[PDB]
Design a protein around this ligand. Structure first.
Ligand SMILES: Cc1cc2nc3c(=O)[nH]c(=O)nc-3n(C[C@H](O)[C@H](O)[C@H](O)COP(=O)(O)OP(=O)(O)OC[C@H]3O[C@@H](n4cnc5c(N)ncnc54)[C@H](O)[C@@H]3O)c2cc1C
Ligand SMILES: Cc1cc2nc3c(=O)[nH]c(=O)nc-3n(C[C@H](O)[C@H](O)[C@H](O)COP(=O)(O)OP(=O)(O)OC[C@H]3O[C@@H](n4cnc5c(N)ncnc54)[C@H](O)[C@@H]3O)c2cc1C
Lengths: 459, 459
């Protein structure tokens, strides 16, 4: 049997752990899927590449509004996929060879499970290929996996997820997307801009429900005009109709479509770990971690979607930085460790219009009994919005009336993820709204003026 | 003669002075040109509207690179001008009626000059229409005016400036722009994107020279490939060629063109005031003001291009806010006034690629003997740059090695004026580079990751 000093399960954010501090130790890496993780191969990086291609097509269609008559001749979807994955797929191989060729790091490419803890304190790990090894410290970065509704699974129909829809041969004529999350909204923007008829079948009343109701209500109204929105509906059955699909809904109506995309959420991969056999406690479906990313087992850390409540890459990277430091630091030296901070976490949804938010919502501050001041500023009231002829873009700020500090920031409009950054800086470092408005300069007539005027308007 | 409490010369930024605190005094407004000023009618607002229209056309032309085959059918230049100025021109009428119809405000629409000071100490003002009146307090906001080379004026050739070139009937086939400032660079981007052949005749060696040399050198190289750049050349003579022009250069070569655009700089309007007859001192060609915007004459303030060294609207509005407060404040109570802030002034040039900068450049910090750290981060190294397939976007940061604070920030690329705002906030409030990188969250995979990596790369 082989002995290792540290074993990491998952090459997502856990790949960024073995640095030069581990040059004298023997490490083992486990990756049941493709090297690199989810974000690179089938996640954030390839999706936003398709989004920018969609944003190019959206500009051409609405060019007539500005005085330029243009039209799209062809959408070479085959070359778009080749351009996207021609950059990503070779990256996964280079990173895989960089770790495998290292003499002190050994890579296992099968599903690894937890075994009973050995007498000496070392953790036994077993792979689905039949490999057994031990490690003093163990890092859990198993991530998450998609969830498919049981009614869709029991139907036996051909469906697609975010993991497989990005490598399709030809663009369909009509697609049905089941879901209302950030994945479902971004894909609706991609296919619609490329010329596909999009139909959203959501079970709730608003798209992107966990956003502020002001944003969700305005965006759901705008989205309902460009896409076919079926609210309060659930898919109960379906059958093949050739290359397409025929799905029956909970109200008796049936929908014919060429492709079915399931985006009903994701849950952690902790259930396929046998963590109970090693002393790691699991609640709901996630791994229990503390402020030092320490689990209920001595020497075992965890990070990423497998434990964190935020399924975001910028959060998983902050937890990977905590694991890197709190590792080499004795298990009980909590004064010499670093605490993971989750205060003011931002998020963005790359749709049309783009949405980006950070902090509490208006109703969330009300539920906490805070005396708040709210201002909603439109893009069309700023000089840059005049050049854009914008008629829907907004930026919403919530501040505590007493302290004058920012409580929440919700933007829905052009360059939402970029204009939200100066607002993230004020919240993270404790800058009051009055200081952000008049304490610095804003270039005229740049776009961030809509954030400046929103602060001035906070009556 | 008419008695007034306050008289303001210039309805540009000076219009934002008359508040409800003066709702009982008799005020006089002077506007020799069109109401609203330079920025709205013939400046920033209409120019940046044409820029966005040009940026839309630029996206369609290079759309094939991303997999979308498109082409521009027609450029309705007449509808672009009508859409822009159909929105701007009525604003000048509404703002003009808003002041004239007020019983306490009287509007004079001719050029106003300074007269000899009256015996009682009040300032006499005379307009070119024959109106004489007096005022207790005077605000000078005369702005600036374009500068035309003497060789072009003595030639008798038909030339255009930023005040007149935007309302042309039909787009020319070939245009020549004489100048290297921010005005000349933005207009070269506008006409080139709309299909005009652009030829730059600059007197120096680099385009946008007063910017960081790293930016100027890279931008001048890019501009030389899409536009015809003739460096170290000056127009010495010219003659009409029909609807076009034939210009003679300082090296004997002649250029035939359809339109001539002059962007060789601007000069303050203080020289056309007879200001020495009222006791207000003039240096160079601008009015001398102190840190409280006070001139050398008791009761006389000044703001805008007529005095400030920075010819920017966001600076002229900050100076108008200081005048508005220190006006209503006793002339000798300097302890109860507000100081004009010129510490971290930003600027942007809306060209292709877009440029935005704030603070000192690398060569400026060297001349001051500061131990600095410099990092140049490429757009192509961030996840958003992959979706953009960017190959030229950069962000340059200069920090003091000792204090660790930001000394300068120079960006050349997509969303330059928007990406620089979080950097302006850190400099204006005293945030260190290490705090900006790891003290807050950056949305993945948003564009501001290039600013985060530029801070992380500093060593
Ligand atoms: C379509 C899509 C778009 C997204 N867009 C964004 C976005 O814009 N911004 C953002 O912040 N986040 C985004 N995310 C979320 C982001 O991708 C994840 O939150 C992030 O990848 C989680 O990192 P991780 O390393 O914990 O998970 P992963 O990167 O998935 O790491 C888990 C890896 O380990 C493997 N593994 C699991 N269990 C085992 C085992 N027992 N043995 C061996 N190997 C195992 C898995 O196969 C996988 O390769 C998106 C996700 C999706 C699906
Ligand atoms: C093409 C162009 C683009 C620009 N783009 C930008 C940009 O993107 N960002 C930016 O920050 N700045 C920009 N500027 C600069 C900006 O326009 C000025 O810095 C700002 O408008 C200064 O305001 P002001 O009120 O002092 O000048 P003005 O707005 O010109 O005010 C002066 C007004 O008073 C009148 N006047 C002058 N003298 C007299 C007199 N004796 N009697 C009566 N009336 C008089 C003038 O005719 C004029 O109408 C640009 C300028 C130009 C020309």
């Amino acid at each position: 049997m082989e002995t290792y000093d540290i074993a990491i399960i998952g090459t997502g954010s856990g790949n960024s752990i073995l640095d030069e501090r581990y040059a004298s130790k023997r490490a083992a890496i486990c990756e049941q899927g493709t090297f690199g993780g989810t974000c690179l191969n089938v996640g954030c990086i390839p999706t936003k590449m398709f989004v920018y291609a969609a944003e190019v097509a959206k500009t051409i269609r609405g060019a007539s509004r500005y005085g330029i008559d243009a039209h799209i001749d062809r959408v070479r979807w085959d070359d778009v996929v080749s351009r996207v994955f021609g950059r990503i797929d070779p990256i996964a191989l280079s990173g895989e060879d960089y770790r495998r060729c290292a003499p002190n790091i050994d890579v296992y490419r099968t599903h690894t499970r937890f075994g009973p803890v050995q007498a000496d304190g070392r953790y036994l790990l077993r792979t689905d290929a039949g490999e057994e090894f031990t490690a003093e410290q163990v890092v859990i970065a198993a991530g998450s996996r998609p969830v498919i509704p049981p009614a869709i699974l029991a139907s036996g129909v051909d469906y697609h997820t975010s993991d497989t829809v990005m490598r399709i041969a030809e663009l369909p004529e009509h697609i049905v997307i089941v879901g209302s999350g950030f994945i479902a909204a971004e894909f609706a923007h991609v296919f619609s801009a490329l010329g596909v008829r999009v139909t959203l079948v959501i079970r709730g009343s608003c798209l992107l429900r966990h956003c502020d109701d002001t944003i969700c209500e305005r965006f759901t109204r705008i989205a309902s005009t460009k896409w076919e929105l079926r609210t309060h509906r659930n898919v109960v059955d379906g059958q093949q109709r050739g290359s397409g699909v025929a799905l029956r809904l909970d109200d008796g109506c049936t929908i014919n479509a060429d492709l079915l995309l399931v985006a009903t959420g994701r849950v952690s991969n902790a259930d396929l770990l046998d963590a109970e056999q090693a002393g790691v406690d699991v609640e709901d479906g996630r791994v229990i971690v503390d402020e030092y990313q320490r689990t209920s087992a001595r020497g075992v850390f965890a990070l990423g979607d497998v434990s964190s409540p935020y399924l975001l890459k910028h959060v998983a990277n902050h937890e990977a930085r905590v694991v890197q430091h709190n590792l080499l630091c004795d298990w009980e030296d909590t004064q010499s460790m670093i605490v993971t901070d989750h205060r003011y976490v931002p998020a963005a949804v790359f749709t049309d219009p783009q949405i980006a938010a950070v902090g509490l919502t208006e109703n969330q501050a009300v539920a906490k009994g805070l005396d708040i001041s709210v201002k909603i500023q439109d893009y069309g009231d700023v000089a840059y919005g005049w050049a854009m002829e914008d008629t829907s873009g907004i930026v919403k700020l919530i501040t505590e009336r007493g302290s004058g500090r920012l409580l929440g920031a919700h933007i829905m409009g052009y360059q939402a993820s970029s204009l939200i950054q100066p607002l993230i800086q004020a919240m993270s470092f404790g800058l009051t709204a009055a200081e952000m408005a008049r304490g610095q300069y804003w270039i005229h007539p740049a776009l961030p003026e809509v954030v400046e005027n929103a602060l001035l308007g906070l009556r």
